[PDB]
Amino acid sequence: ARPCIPKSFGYSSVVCVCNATYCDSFDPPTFPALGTFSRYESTRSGRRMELSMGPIQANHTGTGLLLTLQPEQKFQKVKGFGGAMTDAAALNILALSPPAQNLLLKSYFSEEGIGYNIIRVPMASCDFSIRTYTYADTPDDFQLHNFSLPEEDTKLKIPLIHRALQLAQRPVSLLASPWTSPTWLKTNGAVNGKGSLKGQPGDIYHQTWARYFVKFLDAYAEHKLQFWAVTAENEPSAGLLSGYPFQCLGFTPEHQRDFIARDLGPTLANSTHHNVRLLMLDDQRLLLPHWAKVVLTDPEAAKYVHGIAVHWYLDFLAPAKATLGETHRLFPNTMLFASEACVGSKFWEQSVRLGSWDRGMQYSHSIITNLLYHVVGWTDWNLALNPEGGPNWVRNFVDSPIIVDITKDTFYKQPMFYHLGHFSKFIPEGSQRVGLVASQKNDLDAVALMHPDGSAVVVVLNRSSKDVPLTIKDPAVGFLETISPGYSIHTYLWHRQ
Amino acid sequence: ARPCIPKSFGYSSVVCVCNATYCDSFDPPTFPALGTFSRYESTRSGRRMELSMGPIQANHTGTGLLLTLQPEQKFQKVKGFGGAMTDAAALNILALSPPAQNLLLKSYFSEEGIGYNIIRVPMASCDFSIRTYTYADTPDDFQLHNFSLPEEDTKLKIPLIHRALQLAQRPVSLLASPWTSPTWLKTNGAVNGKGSLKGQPGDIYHQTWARYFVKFLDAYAEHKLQFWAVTAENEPSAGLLSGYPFQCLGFTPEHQRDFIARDLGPTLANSTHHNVRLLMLDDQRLLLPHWAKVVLTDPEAAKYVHGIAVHWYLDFLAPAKATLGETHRLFPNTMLFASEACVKFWEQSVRLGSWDRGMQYSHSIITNLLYHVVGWTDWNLALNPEGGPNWVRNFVDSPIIVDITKDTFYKQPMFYHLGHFSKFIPEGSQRVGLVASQKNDLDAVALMHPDGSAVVVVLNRSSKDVPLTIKDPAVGFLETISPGYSIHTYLWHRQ
Numbered sequence: 001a002r003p004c005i006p007k008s009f010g011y012s013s014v015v016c017v018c019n020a021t022y023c024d025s026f027d028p029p030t031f032p033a034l035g036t037f038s039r040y041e042s043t044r045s046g047r048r049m050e051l052s053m054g055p056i057q058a059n060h061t062g063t064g065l066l067l068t069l070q071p072e073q074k075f076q077k078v079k080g081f082g083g084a085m086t087d088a089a090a091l092n093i094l095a096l097s098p099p100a101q102n103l104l105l106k107s108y109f110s111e112e113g114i115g116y117n118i119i120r121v122p123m124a125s126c127d128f129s130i131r132t133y134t135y136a137d138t139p140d141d142f143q144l145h146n147f148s149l150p151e152e153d154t155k156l157k158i159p160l161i162h163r164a165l166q167l168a169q170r171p172v173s174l175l176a177s178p179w180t181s182p183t184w185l186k187t188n189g190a191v192n193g194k195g196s197l198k199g200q201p202g203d204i205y206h207q208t209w210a211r212y213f214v215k216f217l218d219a220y221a222e223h224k225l226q227f228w229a230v231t232a233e234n235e236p237s238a239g240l241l242s243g244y245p246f247q248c249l250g251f252t253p254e255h256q257r258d259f260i261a262r263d264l265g266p267t268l269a270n271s272t273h274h275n276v277r278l279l280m281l282d283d284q285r286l287l288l289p290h291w292a293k294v295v296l297t298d299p300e301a302a303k304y305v306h307g308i309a310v311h312w313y314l315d316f317l318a319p320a321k322a323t324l325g326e327t328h329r330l331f332p333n334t335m336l337f338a339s340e341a342c343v344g345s346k347f348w349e350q351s352v353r354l355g356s357w358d359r360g361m362q363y364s365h366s367i368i369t370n371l372l373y374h375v376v377g378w379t380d381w382n383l384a385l386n387p388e389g390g391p392n393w394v395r396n397f398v399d400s401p402i403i404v405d406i407t408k409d410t411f412y413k414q415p416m417f418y419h420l421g422h423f424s425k426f427i428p429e430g431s432q433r434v435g436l437v438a439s440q441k442n443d444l445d446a447v448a449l450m451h452p453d454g455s456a457v458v459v460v461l462n463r464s465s466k467d468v469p470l471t472i473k474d475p476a477v478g479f480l481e482t483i484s485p486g487y488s489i490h491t492y493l494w495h496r497q
Numbered sequence: 498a499r500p501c502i503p504k505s506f507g508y509s510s511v512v513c514v515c516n517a518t519y520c521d522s523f524d525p526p527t528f529p530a531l532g533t534f535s536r537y538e539s540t541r542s543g544r545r546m547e548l549s550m551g552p553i554q555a556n557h558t559g560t561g562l563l564l565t566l567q568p569e570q571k572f573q574k575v576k577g578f579g580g581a582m583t584d585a586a587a588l589n590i591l592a593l594s595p596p597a598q599n600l601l602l603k604s605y606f607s608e609e610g611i612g613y614n615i616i617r618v619p620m621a622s623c624d625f626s627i628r629t630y631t632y633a634d635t636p637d638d639f640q641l642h643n644f645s646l647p648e649e650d651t652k653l654k655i656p657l658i659h660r661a662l663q664l665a666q667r668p669v670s671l672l673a674s675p676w677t678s679p680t681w682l683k684t685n686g687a688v689n690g691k692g693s694l695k696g697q698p699g700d701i702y703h704q705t706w707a708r709y710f711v712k713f714l715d716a717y718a719e720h721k722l723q724f725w726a727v728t729a730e731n732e733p734s735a736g737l738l739s740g741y742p743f744q745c746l747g748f749t750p751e752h753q754r755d756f757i758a759r760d761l762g763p764t765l766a767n768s769t770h771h772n773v774r775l776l777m778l779d780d781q782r783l784l785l786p787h788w789a790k791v792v793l794t795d796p797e798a799a800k801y802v803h804g805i806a807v808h809w810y811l812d813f814l815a816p817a818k819a820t821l822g823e824t825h826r827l828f829p830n831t832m833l834f835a836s837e838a839c840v841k842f843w844e845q846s847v848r849l850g851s852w853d854r855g856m857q858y859s860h861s862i863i864t865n866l867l868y869h870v871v872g873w874t875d876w877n878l879a880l881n882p883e884g885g886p887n888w889v890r891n892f893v894d895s896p897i898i899v900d901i902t903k904d905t906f907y908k909q910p911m912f913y914h915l916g917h918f919s920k921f922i923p924e925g926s927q928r929v930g931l932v933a934s935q936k937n938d939l940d941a942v943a944l945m946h947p948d949g950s951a952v953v954v955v956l957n958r959s960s961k962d963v964p965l966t967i968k969d970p971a972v973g974f975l976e977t978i979s980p981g982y983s984i985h986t987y988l989w990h991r992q
């Protein structure tokens with residue numbers, strides 16, 4: 001293990017500096033006897049996933065907040081955590097020297113980093129691209145004889161995905177999402193703006209667009225990459241807005257329902273990629289539960305939909321209970337997944353703030369809220385950006401957990417990276433959220449899960465300036481006496497037998 | 498009397514051009530004879546509140562969309578419509594030649610314009626100011642011996658308000674809202690950023706701040722202006738945010754509750770201005786219903802609160818039933834009032850002739866009216882073509898854009914979308930039920946005037962023409978069409 005090398009850029013906390021020869025990392029995981037817990041701590045004051053151990057004791061010395069594990073109250077199983085291999089992320093990572101590239105990829109994908117097991121892959125260009133392109137830009141090619149992957153896939157994204165999977169011990173799930181179709185399939189003839197597929201579900205335009213998904217999966221399969229899932233479209237609501245500035249393709253909930261039932265579902269099912277899952281929506285949670293009611297009440301669409309993908313960016317427009325909670329209640333057998341788990345940079349702030357503790361707290365706060373409202377997994381957006389929050393061909397109000405400074409062969413791990421890691425490292429695929437009861441009203445955010453092997457994990461976030469004395473009770477083991485310091489995040493792990 | 502002079506700026510529709518000698522206006526209001534209906538139309542294609550009259554048919558057949566009036570299903574009574582006399586609005590208006598000033602004020606405030614009966618007045622400086630003054634900038638002036646109105650009030654706002662009221666036949670209600678206190682009353686000692694009043698409700702800071710509201714009302718009353726209402730603070734949630742870029746003053750809902758109960762409520766009640774009403778919140782409706790529960794479950798605060806003031810940002814959509822609807826349900830005797838609205842860092846701050854931005858206005862007013870809201874107040878009455886001035890460059894759009902170099906002003910689609918409501922819904926109008934016979938792409942709302950006559954506004958946000966009928970059981974069937982990208986106001990006598 002190597003500790004964080006801290007650097008301040010004048011914001012509330014520090015980044016951890018990595019270069020060709022040095023990056024902070026963990027020892028292989030190693031968990032103690034019954035009656036002992038492990039704690040990992042990160043603080044605004046500068047501690048970065050520091051390990052300590054202590055006792056779980058028969059006697060309860062604490063008189064403050066008590067959180068009681070309720071392992072018999074069982075909720076969702078976790079699919080996992082990761083981020084997006086955009087053109088921008090791949091260009092940033094590949095501009096480091098190879099030893100630094102390897103340390104950046106280990107930070108995310110190795111058991112000695114934070115154990116990512118999901119990668120989201122754009123299908124061709126988006127805002128985080130240095131140019132507009134699709135896989136089939138030659139028009140009137142309805143059989144897609146001229147479908148092909150450019151250098152962005154074959155030179156940048158695919159090689160980095162192979163390297164990410166080689167570093168990971170955990171199986172990695174790939175998720176694909178398209179932003180735009182070829183412009184000759186669109187009503188507006190442009191990559192952006194208000195525009196849908198020409199014609200109507202069932203017709204040659206809709207069949208061609210469905211076939212493009214299969215051509216995409218074939219091309220990645222020729223490069224020894226298989227997908228867990230695809231989404232029906234990235235932010236389908238964007239393509240219904242006049243002047244939408246970057247790559248989009250508009251679907252009303254009804255058009256998504258009919259495109260899935262008539263074209264995309266049957267096309268995937270008749271292909272060699274019939275095991276690939278399909279997620280719907282891939283858009284703001286305020287569109288729930290309406291979008292889920294329109295698509296999932298039609299059995300011919302429902303039979304092809306494995307899950308509902310939600311984006312965080314505009315979460316402030318509607319609370320979790322009315323959107324995620326109501327959707328689960330109405331469709332309890334369709335998983336919820338956060339496919340774009342990134343937060344907006346307030347208009348009076350720069351897109352990248354090196355060392356922002358606040359932006360880290362926004363990530364851990366949203367993951368806890370999601371977990372308390374049935375969500376099974378998270379993909380962050382860009383795995384890495386440059387210090388301007390690019391490259392991007394339009395203009396964006398977003399940060400990234402890793403910021404690459406090409407000119408110094410160095411990369412900076414943001415507080416966001418450690419806030420993600422407090423979940424991603426310690427919540428493997430198949431972990432199950434369980435009860436955790438607060439004894440009294442409190443200012444903490446907390447969640448409990450049980451690993452597949454039955455061991456406990458609890459994450460405690462303190463977004464307040466005040467230290468909160470805390471007891472955690474495991475009925476099977478006893479009492480964990482601890483403190484949640486102001487502006488801290490803790491992950492607690494223990495054996496239950 | 499005078500039609501729109503259209504001008505394209507290359508966007509989806511036209512502005513109407515006004516100058517020192519010409520502005521579009523209406524004839525004095527008329528009412529259609531019993532058995533007939535009036536229709537005012539505005540279209541993306543360029544019609545601007547064009548008047549036509551049709552017959553009310555005793556019979557109707559067909560499977561086409563029917564909207565049926567439920568005159569016995571009675572909802573909220575309307576307070577009115579208007580906008581804000583900011584420093585920026587007044588500076589722009591007073592840079593026109595006097596005759597052009599007069600035609601701008603008539604456009605909004607005359608019976609021959611769109612009949613505004615609300616003006617929102619900032620208490621000292623906001624982002625739509627060219628500097629950052631309060632009325633009491635002498636440090637630690639707890640007795641407010643150096644309280645005074647600067648030229649922004651005495652030379653720009655007050656004279657324009659007097660002129661607006663002189664033009665208006667309808668009584669006008671003035672609404673006052675502060676953005677910041679003096680810096681010496683604030684924890685952070687700055688007009689902007691994260692900061693709340695120093696100390697605790699009941700203390701010298703909180704009593705001085707409450708006495709500042711009385712000094713404001715005293716000074717406006719010396720200038721023969723009286724207020725209908727004040728808000729407890731503009732966007733109190735803003736001053737809880739670190740780096741908040743312009744004038745703000747942070748309150749939690751608990752802090753607002755306690756400031757009203759201990760200081761602002763009693764101070765106003767013991768003053769010569771006790772008839773002035775107090776609105777709480779004055780902020781974005783996502784804070785509802787929690788903010789209303791915190792303040793209004795405390796009877797010591799509730800007894801001082803007349804209403805809940807809401808804001809929205811029209812490029813976004815928010816739930817209305819869960820915020821406005823649930824608030825009305827908990828607190829049905831406390832009116833909801835929309836005190837600020839406006840309109841994509843990619844599009845300019847001002848898009849001269851944007852039909853889209855017009856439809857965002859009328860959609861928002863219909864949404865609000867369908868969820869108990871009694872009034873709807875635009876932001877700046879007028880801005881320059883850059884969307885200014887604004888000392889932090891927080892430029893936005895306005896229904897009237899002043900071109901000082903040309904002694905010209907442009908009435909945007911927003912002005913006409915607003916007018917379709919403000920001109921035809923007098924104070925005291927009551928919203929009534931209006932049931933659709935089938936799912937449809939139309940926004941519609943029905944109200945009855947104090948005198949019993951009917952008004953229906955219909956907006957078509959789709960590109961498709963929609964045939965429809967309006968049924969009023971007292972008179973019969975109004976056969977009509979909503980063209981795609983149109984807004985219509987219908988008027989008829991019921992007896």
Ligand SMILES: *[C@@H]1O[C@H](CO)[C@@H](O[C@@H]2O[C@H](CO)[C@@H](O[C@@H]3O[C@H](CO)[C@@H](O)[C@H](O)[C@@H]3O)[C@H](O)[C@H]2NC(C)=O)[C@H](O)[C@H]1NC(C)=O
Nearest residue numbers: 499500501502503514515516517518519520521903904905
């Ligand atoms: C203020 O705006 C008004 C209205 O747009 C301007 O009045 C208009 O002046 C134009 C001059 O360009 C007139 O156009 C010409 O009219 C003559 C006489 O009928 C005709 O022979 C020409 O073919 C041409 O159309 C227009 O009639 C007139 N409209 C009205 C109602 O007066 C006015 O010039 C503007 N004032 C300033 C200072 O710019």
Ligand SMILES: *[C@@H]1[C@H](O)[C@@H](O)[C@H](O)[C@@H](Cn2cc(CCCOC[C@]34C[C@H]5C[C@H](C[C@H](C5)C3)C4)nn2)[C@H]1O
Nearest residue numbers: 126127234235311313340395396397398812813841
């Ligand atoms: C998710 C998306 O799929 C990614 O492509 C994108 O990079 C990412 C982060 N993001 C968004 C932005 C700027 C905001 C884009 O406009 C949003 C919008 C859309 C309409 C409604 C509302 C007001 C305006 C019109 C602007 C919000 N920068 N980075 C995610 O969006």
Ligand SMILES: *[C@@H]1[C@H](O)[C@@H](O)[C@H](O)[C@@H](Cn2cc(CCCOC[C@]34C[C@H]5C[C@H](C[C@H](C5)C3)C4)nn2)[C@H]1O
Nearest residue numbers: 316623624625731732781809810813837839891893
């Ligand atoms: C009202 C305010 O009192 C005026 O001083 C100001 O000039 C005016 C214009 N305006 C708009 C904005 C911010 C636009 C985006 O903010 C984010 C947002 C958007 C909605 C959802 C959520 C809560 C709010 C509504 C704010 C996040 N700044 N000034 C008005 O603000």
Ligand SMILES: *[C@@H]1O[C@H](CO)[C@@H](O[C@@H]2O[C@H](CO)[C@@H](O)[C@H](O)[C@H]2NC(C)=O)[C@H](O)[C@H]1NC(C)=O
Nearest residue numbers: 002005006017018019020021022023408409410
């Ligand atoms: C990569 O970062 C590491 C750690 O910050 C740097 O290693 C330090 O190098 C200096 C020599 O200038 C030593 O005195 C320190 O003891 C080193 N620290 C450790 C822990 O090894 C290294 O300099 C960096 N590389 C570059 C090119 O700057």
Ligand SMILES: *[C@@H]1O[C@H](CO)[C@@H](O)[C@H](O)[C@H]1NC(C)=O
Nearest residue numbers: 634635636638642643644645
């Ligand atoms: C404050 O008022 C006093 C007394 O009336 C006056 O002499 C002084 O000029 C004022 N201060 C400012 C800054 O205007």
